[PDB]
Nucleic acid binder design. Structure first.
Length: 747
DNA sequence: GTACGCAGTTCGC
């Protein structure tokens, strides 16, 4: 099983290193024959002699094209003839590619921004994490005395805890008598002992939580000032710190540094992403937070250091357990994308689709288009189109509801109608499909690049779902469930890709055609069920709707829907099909995107209401949840009223716990690009002045204190809140938080 | 930083 791959340099030549694990043994395979390359579209083949003689001078060494090779590829389905230009080293590619482009005989270059390691895995057909190997994992965390804005690595690390499946220990240079605490003499010996532990355990995966931007980086900085060789790699090497724009990333050669933080942000929606919120989300019980204000007073006084030693041990153990749950899912994603677990776990959906498309492009001799230049990127950002159909719901309570949704509407449309930039308005075909309203035509004579890819994807999902039915191993069934679910997410994101401004295969006309077809298909089904089958559709959004027959009994509502399923699915073309979501006793549709609906087993499903939003305080969510749980399940408005009158009196009496009053809002940009101040924006400026890290994506936790005027003039971060000196704005959380949320349901 | 559709709160003016 392939874990990772990079390249070293030997006698000036690159040698790919394939880090493997076979039969429980670490191995490293070496490939010395692979070379970097770009593609060049030449005006005349005769100009290749002048193009070879294009030279650059990097590192004081004259760099040149080492091999020119003319190849025939397809560019948006059309055969193209380009020159494959090879270089000696991947590092001199960025220095010479601009001069190759600048040649007047070169129309353009292609595939010039693909890293050497990822180029190798693609061109060789190598899929990481494929195989039957159990990976050994070790989690670790550190406890420091670092201050916000206090450089980085200047404060000493106090504690280093680690945890695997066999133990969880704390290493420290402070006298603590706990049986899991190993007291060393110096901070240096604490770090060195940690290095031996990792070396002795030799784990395939090092698990951290936010280790890319703190724990690992701080460890490297402390080892720098203290003069310690931070040897962690299986090749005797130090972890490497790279930059990802607003973010840093730490890589440990020979192992996989699995930072859980970028994975949780992209997999789970949470109000905040502290290790304790995460723990309380995936696992049942909570965690006993230990704040940096206590860790300083615990060193100073020396007392209570047992507590922080326990919290350091709990962080490591919780990090390991969360890692053991999320690593299998991310392993399946790396297999699907075909890139390393290290890179897959830290990249966005758009980047995962790019790597997948680039691989599939290689398999089909499809030359990849370049990412847009500045003007084109901006043009794509300034461009939009119409999307899904959202029916204004029949607002109120309704009884006896059936839900019918399309199966992968986007991918079904793209495959059925061959929606692809290589088929759009393609000339000379015998068969065409025309997108409604927008009128774009798509050639059906030959499979387009993307539609053919989606067909293989939806195929593969059926093959995985089939095995998942007829397999015994509950772990294997789960791993397969990960795969088929990942295939569905990957496929369904392909519609929006066509409108992604950074996409190589960007096609606004294609994206326009998917939504236009989807709008036609849903409105046609909604009309058919209301015409021929006497149904009344209540709520409808994009690919699905909620319908019923007024007055009809619960059973005949079901049996008449199944009747409509076989009717509409016959006339439906291609892979377009309607499925049966489920029957639900009652359902209140407050407004567009805002509804809730109760199944037969008395478990409410909630969508769009303030209950699920993170920018609403828990006191408002809980009350709305309890209020909605009344009218939906117990139908009691009088109780619902007693709940509102209840929670208002606790707030006015200042008895509701302040933690139920924090609002979680995200910073989405540089604080200076904001053209309108808000509560969370003003709190962010205070933290920015305090030295606190303030970047796009930082969740702001703040409370509104009592007073009058701008909410932002009365808002402070929660870590600055103190009931002994602060008084919270109860009136605000009554009039602007609790009362508006409960009003929507009662109205 | 896959897309657009959409509700609802804060704030300037």
């Amino acid at each position: 099983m392939i874990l990772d791959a990079d390249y070293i340099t030997e006698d000036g030549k690159p040698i790919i290193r394939i880090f493997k694990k076979e039969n429980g043994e670490f191995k490293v395979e070496y490939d010395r024959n692979f070379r970097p390359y770009i593609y060049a579209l030449l005006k005349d083949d005769s100009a290749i002699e002048d193009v070879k003689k294009i030279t650059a001078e990097r590192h004081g060494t004259t760099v040149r094209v080492v091999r020119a090779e003319k190849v025939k590829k397809k560019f948006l389905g059309r055969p193209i003839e380009v020159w494959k230009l090879y270089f000696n080293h991947p590092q001199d590619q960025p220095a010479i590619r601009d001069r190759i482009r600048a040649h007047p005989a070169v129309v353009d270059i292609y595939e010039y921004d693909i890293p050497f390691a990822k180029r190798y895995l693609i061109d060789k057909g190598l899929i990481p994490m494929e195989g039957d190997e159990e990976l050994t994992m070790l989690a670790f965390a550190i406890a420091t005395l670092y201050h916000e804005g206090e450089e980085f690595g200047t404060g000493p690390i106090l504690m280093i805890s680690y945890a695997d499946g066999s133990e969880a220990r704390v290493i420290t240079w402070k006298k603590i008598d706990l049986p899991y605490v190993d007291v060393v003499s110096t901070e240096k010996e604490m770090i060195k002992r940690f290095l031996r532990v990792v070396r002795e355990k030799d784990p395939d995966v090092l698990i951290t939580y936010n280790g890319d931007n703190f724990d690992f980086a701080y460890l490297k900085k402390r080892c720098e000032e203290l003069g310690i060789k931070f040897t962690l790699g299986r090749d005797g090497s130090e972890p490497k710190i790279q930059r990802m724009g607003d973010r840093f990333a730490v890589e440990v050669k020979g192992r996989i540094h699995f930072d859980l933080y970028p994975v949780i942000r992209r997999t789970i929606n949470l109000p905040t992403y502290t290790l304790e919120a995460v723990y309380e989300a995936i696992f049942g019980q909570p965690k006993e937070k230990v704040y940096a204000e206590e860790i300083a007073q615990a060193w100073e006084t020396g007392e209570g250091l047992e507590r922080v030693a326990r919290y350091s041990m709990e962080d490591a153990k919780v990090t390991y357990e969360l890692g053991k749950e999320f690593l299998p899912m991310e392993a399946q994603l790396s297999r699907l994308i075909g890139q390393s677990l290290w890179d897959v776990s830290r990249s966005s959906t758009g980047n995962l689709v790019e790597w997948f498309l680039l691989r599939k492009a290689y398999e089909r001799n499809e030359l990849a288009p370049n990412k847009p230049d500045e003007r084109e990127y901006e043009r794509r950002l300034r461009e939009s189109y119409a999307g899904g159909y959202v029916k204004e719901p029949e607002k109120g309570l309704w009884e006896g509801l059936v839900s019918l949704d399309f199966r992968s509407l986007g991918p079904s449309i793209i495959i059925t109608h061959n929606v692809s930039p290589d088929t759009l308005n393609r000339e000379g075909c015998r068969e065409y499909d025309v997108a409604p309203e927008v009128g774009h035509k798509f050639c059906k004579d030959f499979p387009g690049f993307i539609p053919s890819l989606l067909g293989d994807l939806l195929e593969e999902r059926q093959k995985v779902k089939k095995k998942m039915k007829a397999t015994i191993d509950p772990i294997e069934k789960k791993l397969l469930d990960y795969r088929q679910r990942l295939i569905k997410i990957l496929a369904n994101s392909f519609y929006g890709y066509y409108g992604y401004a950074k996409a190589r295969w960007y096609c606004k006309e294609c994206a326009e055609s998917v939504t236009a077809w989807g709008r036609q298909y849903i409105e046609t089904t909604i009309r058919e069920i209301e015409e021929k089958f006497g149904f009344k559709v209540l709520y409808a959004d994009t690919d699905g709707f909620f319908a019923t027959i007024p007055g009809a009994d619960a059973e005949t509502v079901k049996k008449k829907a199944k009747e409509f399923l076989d009717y509409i699915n016959a006339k439906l073309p291609g892979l377009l099909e309607l499925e049966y979501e489920g029957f639900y006793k009652r359902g209140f549709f407050v407004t567009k995107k805002k509804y809730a609906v109760i199944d037969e087993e008395d478990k409410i499903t909630t969508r769009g209401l303030e209950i699920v939003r993170r920018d609403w305080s828990e006191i408002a969510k809980e009350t709305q949840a309890r209020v909605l749980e009344a009218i939906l399940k117990h139908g009691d408005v009088e109780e619902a009223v007693r709940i509102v009158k209840e929670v208002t009196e606790k707030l006015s009496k200042y008895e509701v716990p302040p933690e139920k009053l924090v609002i979680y809002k995200q910073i989405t940009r540089d604080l200076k690009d904001y053209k309108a101040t808000g509560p969370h924006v003003a709190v962010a400026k205070r933290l920015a002045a305090r030295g606190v890290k303030i970047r796009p994506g930082t969740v702001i936790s703040y409370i509104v204190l009592k007073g009058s005027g701008r909410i932002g003039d009365r808002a402070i971060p929660f870590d600055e809140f103190d009931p002994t000196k602060h008084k919270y704005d109860a009136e605000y959380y009554i009039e602007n938080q609790v009362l508006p949320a409960v009003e929507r349901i009662l109205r």
